[PDB]
Amino acid sequence: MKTSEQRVNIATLLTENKKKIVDKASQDLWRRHPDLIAPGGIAFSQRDRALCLRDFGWFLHLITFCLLAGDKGPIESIGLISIREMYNSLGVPVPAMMESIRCLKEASLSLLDEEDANETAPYFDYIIKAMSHHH
Amino acid sequence: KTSEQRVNIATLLTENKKKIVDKASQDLWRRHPDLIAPGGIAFSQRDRALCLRDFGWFLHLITFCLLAGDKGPIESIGLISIREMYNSLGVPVPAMMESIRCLKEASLSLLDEEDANETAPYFDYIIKAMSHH
Amino acid sequence: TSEQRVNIATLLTENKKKIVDKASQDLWRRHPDLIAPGGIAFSQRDRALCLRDFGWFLHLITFCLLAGDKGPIESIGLISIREMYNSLGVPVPAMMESIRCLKEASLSLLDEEDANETAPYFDYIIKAMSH
Amino acid sequence: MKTSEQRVNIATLLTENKKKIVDKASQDLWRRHPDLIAPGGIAFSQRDRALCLRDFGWFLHLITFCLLAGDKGPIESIGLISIREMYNSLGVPVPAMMESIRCLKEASLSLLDEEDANETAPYFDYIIKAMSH
Ligand SMILES: [Cl-]
Ligand SMILES: [Cl-]
Ligand SMILES: [Cl-]
Ligand SMILES: [Cl-]
Ligand SMILES: [Cl-]
Ligand SMILES: [Cl-]
């Protein structure tokens, strides 16, 4: 394997448990802020909206792609700027995006062993910092 | 041999299950976000909020009643057992009633006027069953 | 029968996804051409089975379980369901096989006493979907 | 991509119709090779397996990420090589991966307007070439 085996394994494990991770994460946010995450009937492209499960899955895939790519900042990639821009135009609140990704972190890291969690936590942090304040 | 109208209405509701359940759940959620949670929740969990699975359960139930011609006033054995199931789940009565009201509006909006008039009683039957004592 | 039945129905309902995945995959391994991936318009005439058909039938068997309806008399609902699928042009052999797969998947999760209680309700629906 | 807004909109549109695209794509493959795509979920980590819906959604997100990033080769990104490697170890055939991505292409492009399809097609081609060694 050219690419890191650790990374490939972490990515396959996150991919395999996508549903479990997204349920745990969304439910965790919902318990605390029920008004920020709707159960269905929101179009991803709808301006000025609450979170939906699709945002949770988007971000999970994104963090996995970064993990595989070794991209964890400090330089924000072109892709990551375009994502921020996409969400910018969607009008999805910054505090809520940050909180969704924090919930995915806790959900994802709980499934990993300690060495893998330590390796993976920075990639969540990268994406949380990226999706923050205004720009 | 059995009502073609009813079979057609049931097919149409079954086909648009996702669309109906999204609309219905979102409708309830906009008004009472704390009563309907995202994603999968253990259906058997006592003292819980609603999940999408409850919306789909009830839709299938109303469809089965429609197919069976069962719209009260006498409550079937099945329907009493369903109420009982939910009774033990500790799911609030007002919230169950409201979930089924939202499915009604969502389902009837897809039907033409004659079919809506035919189908509305089956929702009312279930809404009344799930409001007990 | 009442509390046992309610509990079995709750348990089947709770494990709907797990049951439907197991059942569909079981059919698919043996007859891949009879069950397609993802969502298909339910009303589309002359189609393959989809996961939604598996979930429909599971809910149906659960309703029968709750109602105590296991034949020999076929309920009007059950005849109308057969009719619905009849017009959809889903093959009879494939429907029967889908329900057999749900049986095996559902019964494997139950303890032996509950499996014995529940098996007849699957058999009822399989016989019903066969004319 | 004419404007950066066009790209953002195409990415939003692909994301929004993920389910519709993945159903169409998987069904398209399935009609031709039913033994290569199983229904409703397989353990993603299982060695020597058939395709599942999760593979279709993975690749769609990947093509969207490339679209947003402006990455359409010819040079393969590190991430893209790692993805190929991931699948390599999963024992999923090269011909089947290529075919899945071709199906997503046709499914995704059919939902776009013709101008947007012309813009988007290169990103699919990039990923198809990448998944071929
Ligand atoms: Cl908080
Ligand atoms: Cl709200
Ligand atoms: Cl009236
Ligand atoms: Cl048709
Ligand atoms: Cl996916
Ligand atoms: Cl145009």
Question: What number of other Cβ atoms are within 10 A of residue C35's Cβ?
Answer: 29
Distance (Å, rounded) from C-alpha C53 to C-alpha D128? Answer: 33
Q: Are C128 and C98 in contact (CB under 8 A)?
A: no
Backbone angles phi, psi at B90, to 5 degrees: 70, 25
Distance (Å, rounded) from C-alpha A10 to C-alpha A7? Answer: 5
Q: Which domains does chain A have, with CATH numbers?
A: 1-135 (1.10.490.20)
Distance (Å, rounded) from C-alpha D63 to C-alpha D57? Answer: 10
For residue D113, how far is its CA from the centre of ligand 6 (angstroms)? 5
The letter for the amino acid at D48 is D
Interface-testing mutation among B23, B28, B29, B36, with chain A (most A C-beta atoms within 10 A)? B29
The letter for the amino acid at C29 is R
Distance (Å, rounded) from C-alpha C82 to C-alpha C85? Answer: 5
* N-term to C-term CA, chain C: 30
Distance (Å, rounded) from C-alpha B66 to C-alpha C15? Answer: 26
Question: What number of other Cβ atoms are within 10 A of residue D68's Cβ?
Answer: 26
Backbone angles phi, psi at B31, to 5 degrees: -90, -40
Q: Are B33 and B98 in contact (CB under 8 A)?
A: no
Distance (Å, rounded) from C-alpha B114 to C-alpha B116? Answer: 5
Distance (Å, rounded) from C-alpha C125 to C-alpha A135? Answer: 60
Considering only alpha carbons, which residue of chain B is nearest residue C45? B11
The letter for the amino acid at A10 is I
Question: What number of other Cβ atoms are within 10 A of residue B122's Cβ?
Answer: 25
The first and second tokens of residue C122, run together, are 């699957």
Distance (Å, rounded) from C-alpha D99 to C-alpha D128? Answer: 8
- Nearest one of B29, B53, B35 to B91, comparing CA atoms: B35
Distance (Å, rounded) from C-alpha B82 to C-alpha B89? Answer: 11
Distance (Å, rounded) from C-alpha C86 to C-alpha C92? Answer: 8
Q: Are B66 and B6 in contact (CB under 8 A)?
A: yes
CB contact under 8 A, D65 and A62: yes
- Nearest one of C98, C82, C76, C106 to C31, comparing CA atoms: C98
For residue C5, how far is its CA from the centre of ligand 4 (angstroms)? 38
Q: How was this structure determined?
A: X-ray
Place of tokens 């089965």: B64
**Residue B57: its chain C contacts at CB < 8 A?**
13, 59
* DSSP percent split of chain D into helix, strand, coil, nearest 5: 70, 0, 25
Opening angle at CA D114, ends D110 and D116, nearest 5: 90
CB contact under 8 A, C39 and D53: no
DSSP D48-77: S--B-HHHHHHHHHHHHHHHHHT---SSPP
Give the orientation angle of helix D53-69 with respect to helix A78-90, to 10 degrees.
100
CB contact under 8 A, B78 and C67: yes
Considering only alpha carbons, which residue of chain A is nearest residue D6? A86
For residue C46, how far is its CA from the centre of ligand 4 (angstroms)? 8
- Nearest CA distance, C120 vs chain B (angstrom): 17
Interface-testing mutation among C1, C12, C66, with chain B (most B C-beta atoms within 10 A)? C66
Distance (Å, rounded) from C-alpha C110 to C-alpha C103? Answer: 11
Q: Give, as one character, the DSSP assignment of residue A77.
A: P
- Nearest one of A50, A63, A43, A53 to A20, comparing CA atoms: A53
Q: Which ligand is nearest to the CA of D115?
A: 6
Tell me the helices (H) and strands (E) count for chain A, helix number first: 6, 0
CB contact under 8 A, D19 and C28: no
Q: Which residues surround ligand 6, an ion (CB under 5 A)?
A: D 113
Q: Are A13 and A112 in contact (CB under 8 A)?
A: yes
Q: Where are the beta strands (DSSP E) in chain D?
A: none
Q: Are B39 and A53 in contact (CB under 8 A)?
A: yes
Distance (Å, rounded) from C-alpha C9 to C-alpha C30? Answer: 28
The first and second tokens of residue C120, run together, are 């007849």
Backbone angles phi, psi at C51, to 5 degrees: -50, -35
For residue B25, how far is its CA from the centre of ligand 2 (angstroms)? 12
Opening angle at CA B14, ends B8 and B20, nearest 5: 115
Q: Are D108 and D14 in contact (CB under 8 A)?
A: yes
Opening angle at CA B126, ends B122 and B130, nearest 5: 170
- Nearest CA distance, A133 vs chain B (angstrom): 26
Q: Which of D44, D66, D71 sits opposite A12 (nearest CB)?
A: D44
Measured in whole angstroms, the distance separating CA D98 from the mean position of its chain's CA atoms is 9
**Residue C42: its chain B contacts at CB < 8 A?**
11, 14-15, 17
